[PDB]
Amino acid sequence: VPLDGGRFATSDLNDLYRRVINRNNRLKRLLDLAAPDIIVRNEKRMLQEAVDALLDNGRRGRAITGSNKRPLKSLADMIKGKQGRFRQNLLGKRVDYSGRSVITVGPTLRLHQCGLPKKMALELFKPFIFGKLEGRGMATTIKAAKKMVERELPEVWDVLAEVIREHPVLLNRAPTLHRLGIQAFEPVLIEGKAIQLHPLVCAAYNADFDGDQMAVHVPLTLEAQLEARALMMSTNNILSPANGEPIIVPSQ
Amino acid sequence: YSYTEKKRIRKDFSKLPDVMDVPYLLAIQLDSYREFLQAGATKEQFRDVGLHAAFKSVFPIISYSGNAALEYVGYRLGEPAFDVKECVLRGVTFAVPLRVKVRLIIFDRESSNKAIKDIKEQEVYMGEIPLMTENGTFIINGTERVIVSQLHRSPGVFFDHDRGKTHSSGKLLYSARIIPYRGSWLDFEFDPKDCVFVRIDRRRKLPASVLLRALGYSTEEILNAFYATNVFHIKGETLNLELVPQRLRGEVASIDIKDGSGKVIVEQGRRITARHINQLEKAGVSQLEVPFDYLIGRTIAKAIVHPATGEIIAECNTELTLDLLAKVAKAQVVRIETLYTNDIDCGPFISDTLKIDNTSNQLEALVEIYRMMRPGEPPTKEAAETLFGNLFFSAERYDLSAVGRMKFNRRIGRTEIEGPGVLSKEDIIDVLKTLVDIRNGKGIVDDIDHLGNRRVRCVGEMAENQFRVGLVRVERAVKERLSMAESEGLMPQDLINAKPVAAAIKEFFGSSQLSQFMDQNNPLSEITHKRRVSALGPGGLTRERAGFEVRDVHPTHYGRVCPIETPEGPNIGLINSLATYARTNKYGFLESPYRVVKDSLVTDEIVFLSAIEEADHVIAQASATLNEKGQLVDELVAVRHLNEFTVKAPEDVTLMDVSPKQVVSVAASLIPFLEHDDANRALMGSNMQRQAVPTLRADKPLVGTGMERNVARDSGVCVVARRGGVIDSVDASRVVVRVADDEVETGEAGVDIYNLTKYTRSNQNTCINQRPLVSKGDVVARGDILADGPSTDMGELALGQNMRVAFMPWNGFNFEDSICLSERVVQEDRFTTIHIQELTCVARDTKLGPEEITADIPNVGEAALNKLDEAGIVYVGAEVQAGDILVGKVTPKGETQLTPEEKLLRAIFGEKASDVKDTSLRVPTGTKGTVIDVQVFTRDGVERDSRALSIEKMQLDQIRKDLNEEFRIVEGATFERLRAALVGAKAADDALNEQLEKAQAYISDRRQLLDDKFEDKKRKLQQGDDLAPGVLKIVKVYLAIKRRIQPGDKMAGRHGNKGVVSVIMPVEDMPHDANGTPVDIVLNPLGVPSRMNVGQILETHLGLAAKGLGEKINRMLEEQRKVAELRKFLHEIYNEIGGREENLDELGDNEILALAKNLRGGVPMATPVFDGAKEREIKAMLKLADLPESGQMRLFDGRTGNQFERPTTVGYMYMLKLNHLVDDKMHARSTGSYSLVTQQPLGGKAQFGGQRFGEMEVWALEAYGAAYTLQEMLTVKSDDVNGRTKMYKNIVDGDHRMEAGMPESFNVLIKEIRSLGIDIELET
Amino acid sequence: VEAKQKERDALAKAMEEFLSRGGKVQEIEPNVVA
Amino acid sequence: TRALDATQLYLNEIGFSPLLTPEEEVHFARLAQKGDPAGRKRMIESNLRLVVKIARRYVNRGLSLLDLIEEGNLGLIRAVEKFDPERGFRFSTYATWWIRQTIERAIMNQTRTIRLPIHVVKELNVYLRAARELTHKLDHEPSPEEIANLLEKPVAEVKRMLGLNERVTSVDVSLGPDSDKTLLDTLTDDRPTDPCELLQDDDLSESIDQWLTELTDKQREVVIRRFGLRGHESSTLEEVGQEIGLTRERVRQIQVEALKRLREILEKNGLSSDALFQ
Amino acid sequence: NHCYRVVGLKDTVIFADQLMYTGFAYSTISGVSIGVNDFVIPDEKARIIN
DNA sequence: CTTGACGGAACCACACGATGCTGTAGCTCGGTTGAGACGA
DNA sequence: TCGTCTCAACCGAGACAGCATCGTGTGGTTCCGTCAAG
Ligand SMILES: [Mg+2]
């Protein structure tokens, strides 16, 4: 890709594949001159170490790049990447319709509901507000819809509150400890930027209010909302999976 | 008495008197920089380690097969021309040259004084000096980065136990890890089968006999001198033995030793006791008779070659047998050399290691060390000898300082502390004697978790090592270039190259992990990041290499390493801190001072004591009973002698502590009541104080420790007074002071300018500023505080603010550890914070079309065009909303392949078909503030924007204004000096004329000086700076967000009580007392039993007492009483049980009114860490101000109104503000641009990405018995092509079908698998 | 360590003897390349 | 044990290379001229010391040493292949010049990801050599102004020439020693790959399709046939003069009044310039 | 756990918020606090230490 | 409903280097493998 | 007297110049899309 100032951003796999391409071209240009045994032995050994540097790195080749000290990345670092021998889809997976925030406690809310600020409520319900705005009959376009949700209009809360009262949301702690770290709740319309939570679920979270970074999740289809309210709604996972004690534990 | 103490004095409670003032905090890096740089010195510089010591070891050189020499007398330091306030706004990174003078002396290659052609000339500037400031930091390309003291392992050899699962034994010896300063890492592992085998980095295991034969020592002499010293002879009764009483001690003698002319010593079957040892000592019989069966177990030292036979009858280091003794008897051997080993003595493991693998030749050891370095190569003796010499003897790519030889001499035992920097074979003899002494069991094993085994480094030694590496690289390059050259054919300047040392000093600060970014969000972070002691980096242990060895502490850290200061997270224990009174040694050793005490009296002098003598000497405790006579009243005190706490006698100790604050670092010591808290939550509170942010209104802390003024004094953001005098005029941009006639020179008496730091950007995107706290017409002293920085007020450290605080679980708002605020903190803007947000936009040049700062940007509405000018930059101080275009950047495009829909919507509106896109940067979501300034950088000889012209003209008129005001103050000082001079005997005349001419010469010199200063400022501001290649103009806009209190902010106190605020509750819902002041921030009472810190209650009680005294002095000032009542009030305050009184000194008209106006907003305390305020003075301070004695207030219910049938506790808690807000962490993304290797969203499209849905997230998702959301979140939210399109069409149209489809993850997998040629097909 | 110090002392003594035995100092420019 | 490497094995294999007098090489070059597979084999298997001596000088580059010894023996066999023995001189200098040409081609083609011809890498090489000569006397960072003043070249020309030198680093070596996050998940592609962009594209296409179906038939025909939106090609009124309307001015007035009608129904539908183009 | 096991889910989770609300109100109108007189120190501790 | 004029693409010839090729001759802990030890 | 049964190290994870076309810049006419004028 073109970078800032005419520069480029390449991976090391381009360099190793270009190197084995040039070594095979030199093999093609050397095989047609009645070559002796020693130089074709050396060239086949060179192609052997070349394709060994193609498949793996850090065993016997130890190839270095120009003007640096880090070794190049083979195709093992494309099927795996970093973090040991774990795959690239298994090392990191940035999921859409998410975003990290800090949490706070809300004591005036029930177990079947929660709080959520409007600044993220305008975006976590974005296909829902697009469908409602194109179905009710106020704005059939999507660019004017983006303009009216970025302009902070007065009617966006009135047309947005229909999918706040009876629509589940997911919330997961970024340090994951057990299966109660993900939950399901019902938002309301409040002010501010951070998220109010149920008090009696932080003991199930094993997450005291220490100002961490908690990410939210919103599934797209309503079938996933129905099954999330069936599987991880807080009126269902009352008992802990360890023993017969409930995971909702009363605090001091 | 300072001038800041007249405005604010602190009531201390230290029962122990202060015997030593707090030293300089950043003096270690200061004198390390002074030793490495050597800026101020005479013609004879110091012979210590540094850049001069690195240059003198390399700069004398000799050409191979030629005649060349290079001499030098010294170097010349460069003058720093770049100002700090202009390099943080321009990007010069404090460039400073360093020129050296080299003498190119040639010879005739005959070792005589013939053809002496010397060329003494000054060379080019070898790189650029960092040129750090007096505060202890240096700027590296715009940002400020600092160094960290590398707490790696000390240079030398250690001997630990290291009991692990690999040895599978109860008692085993660990491997001797020889640690040099740089390079040549050698290992010595002790094999469990009575052997020793050395190790290398890539080579296999090698025996110690081959290593000794490669070093130079023969195997026979080493095997002789390793075990013992005993000779065997054949005389008299067929054998002659040399009896040693030391070896026979504790050995069961199974044979008869009745020789000694009829005197039997030990019979057969009798254990040798001390009585037989004393009998042998009083007898002195050196010859004893043993049978031949005892000689079978013995092992020879060298080979027995008889001169009469002519052949080798016994091999070297072999056992003696029944035929071998008969052969040695029949060969007429007079003296037999063999070793004598016993069971009670040391085990003969060195002989068994030397007898292994048949290593007895020097050529075999040479080819073994050649195969260990370069296996499968041509075995040459000269090449292997040169490789071994460059690895061990020569200093090529190997630098060892004298501290490694000093530690080796302290380990193996030597009278000389200073040793040679090059390693020799004699050190190998000492380390083999040390390892066989450790395997014998005598002595004590070394501890790797000790302060002696972990040396604290600095920037000077690593910078000298990097400069030495670059200098030997440049020397090798110059020797390769000047190989075939001559003296007249080449040049001495053209042969040298300053490029490798410049690249080395570039990578030492740019790509090094030790030169990380300085935490400048808080002054506590600024003073602690210098004093960090990290074990990571090069030559140290990383996070996964810590284990259970370096994460533990030994009691030899008494006053050296503070364990209550380390960052929490994935690394606790290996990154340490430096203590307060701990001062490093010349050898880089961590030492702490101790008070020498005799048996009767107490001495006055203090000596800095190391750690090697504290294991032999007794260290007492300073917190003891003293009757003002120099003796301890108690007969038993907790002392420590052998690095372990015990009880001792007062006439037996020799040393004691200087101050109780010498063990804690400067991070944790600012928390009051450390002795009432646990170290866990005090460490957590110190970490949140290090990660703190400043506030808007800097309110003084209520409960203070006393070192707040000290840490405000040593901080570089404060204004320190160089010279005293009266103050003429005070301005928020600059301040000037007058110079008295005592501390001044003859000419240029009054010259003192102080540019206050304006609102610029820190490293953690927070604002920094200087506020003056003085008046007009007052005198100051040396080191006085003129203007305080952020989170500092009126000379002391004032981080946060205080409010009324009670301990009550109120309606679940403070549920577990949470916070419940009140409307006063949002109505008075108390704990609000303002961040400066950076936005770096580039204007590069592309091959298809250049870019520029043009205001004519397509797709720009009225609200965006009204903010920006005809140039393209928004004006200074405009309101920036969410989604605003700030900078002007238009990029061109060609062959875009536009769709018919885009040209249709372009032709409907009638707009022109603009082929140039708009890639101007905008603000992220949640940022709505006001910009303050914009910094623009252009290239040399390029077109400049008109906004850049306005910026540089504003900067030049500001510079000319401060130059004019300093010229005005210096001409006013000269005129008032002349007017004070002419009044003496006005009514001789030649003197007055002379003085007027001298004053005219002085003001014309000052005028031409400000003219050349303005010329330098013009030539430095009009020129272009060194920027990135391919960039035409670099702009950066400084957006300031006026963030307020929002529901969900982070709020923690000082004792490690983390909490989040819930909502904005009003001032009436909180419970109130009968006085009229309702409580503001209510906390939970779980912080005291669960977290083991009761200092919350004591701090809030002293805060309640301090607010009671403050309200009493406020209503006393309101009641308009006389100064006698105020001084009696101060007398009854400052006459408690703890501390001392400093009254009856201040004057009533000036200083009493000054302390009243500067203490009406609260009073500070001064408590030490381990001998602080007791509880009875707190009960007195509670009971003297019409407050209850136990904090048992009677409160009224604001909610229900029912009377509480229980007394409650209220008070004042001084809490801190954290950098854990929501706005910097908020990611607002519904749909994001997918990646290139798969269809997963990521950042880069002006929207932050989501979280990592890794293995544990999907594991907790399938923890329940469900299957539909697991595939819905995997094929709809990501990893599809048309599935998201058909699902969005089903969402818009309303009807749902839930088609399965085919994801692209299977396509990426089948391509990555078929890239290896794998048959995959479907049956169906 | 000691060998480099002895070589430095010998080179300094030889340079002092050359400067005191008729030899002079050639002051080249600070910025000059062949 | 034994070494499981390749460089050591190569160095042990090249130890059987003889070095006789020059008459043996003269006889081998004379036998190789007529055509025989023995003199070329001896010249390729007995002259590797100069090859490894050439390859040892170009160390610390973007290639491996096996590539350097391979271009060395490739240049040597290309030198002795088309070798003319009429000069009567030593072929070691000819093999040295051929190995220099081959290592220049190896620097040209195996260092940077963007390939370059001979002349641009030659002017880059002499420009970096001149910068290396001037930075010893400048004692500062090299700027293009002094290079343009010394080389008698314009500043924009040498800036465009130094802009080709990208020197791209890796995508796994991040900033700092602790590489907890790579650079693969940092930057995205420049093309529109977001579901928001394609979603706005299909919604705008369906919107203009509904607005063309809700308009008149002639206006929808002249708006679809001119731009090629509703299943039409890239033809206009000059090509549709025998399809829709013969007069170009009449269909142009029809087109601009249809565009005005579309603009006024977008204005009545809540679509303006500031709400569409920010 | 007992009332959950004997009534199911809905009555348990509607009892939970009401118990939480009355616990929050009875914590708000309560008046306990940990003070300096809360930590009672016996006189026999110094005797045991001596 | 007709007419004539200018700015912006649209292949295409000319072309100026420019691509392309060629000749000089001196940390803890689990799977693998070579080596000693005992009975039929 | 030899096959099999343990057993401790080994390894790896969380230069220079010349020759033969050549490919898009640089207009070059030409077609097209639009702008007044009745
Ligand atoms: Mg937490």
Author numbering:
A (entry chain D): 253 to 504
B (entry chain C): 3 to 989, 1020 to 1356
C (entry chain G): 57 to 90
D (entry chain F): 57 to 334
E (entry chain D): 606 to 655
Task: Give verbatim lines from the article.
Pseudomonas aeruginosa (Pae) SutA adapts bacteria to hypoxia and nutrition-limited environment during chronic infection by increasing transcription activity of an RNA polymerase (RNAP) holoenzyme comprising the stress-responsive σ factor σS (RNAP-σS). To understand the molecular mechanism of SutA activation, here we determined cryo-EM structures of RNAP-σS holoenzyme at 4.1 Å, SutA-bound RNAP-σS holoenzyme at 3.1 Å (SutA-RNAP-σS, open lobe) and 3.9 Å (SutA-RNAP-σS, closed lobe), and SutA-bound RNAP-σS promoter open complex (SutA-σS-RPo) at 5.8 Å. The structures reveal that SutA pinches RNAP-β protrusion with its RNAP-binding domain and wedges RNAP-β lobe open to facilitate promoter unwinding with its wedge loop and N-terminal D/E-rich region. SutA anchors RNAP-β protrusion through its RBD and wedges open β lobe through its wedge loop to facilitate RPo formation.
To better understand the action of SutA upon RPo formation, we incubated SutA-RNAP-σS with a duplex rrn promoter DNA (−49 to +21) for 20 s and immediately applied the reaction mixture on grids for cryo-EM data collection. However, we only obtained one major 3D class of single particles, from which a cryo-EM map at 5.8 Å resolution of SutA-bound RPo (SutA-σS-RPo) was reconstructed. The map shows clear density for upstream promoter dsDNA (−35 to −12), 14 bp downstream dsDNA (+4 to +17), and the −10 element (−11 to −10) of non-template ssDNA of the transcription bubble. The cryo-EM map also shows clear signals for SutA-RBD that interacts with RNAP-β protrusion as in the structure of SutA-RNAP-σS (open lobe), but no signal for SutA wedge loop, SutA-NTD, and SutA-CTD, indicating that SutA-RBD remains bound to RNAP upon RPo formation. Structure superimposition of SutA-σS-RPo and SutA-RNAP-σS structures suggests that formation of RPo closes both the β’ clamp and β lobe of RNAP. SutA wedge loop opens the main cleft and facilitate the rrn promoter loading and unwinding. Loading of promoter DNA likely displaces SutA-NTD in the main cleft, disengages the wedge loop, and resumes the flexibility of lobe domain necessary for subsequent promoter unwinding steps.
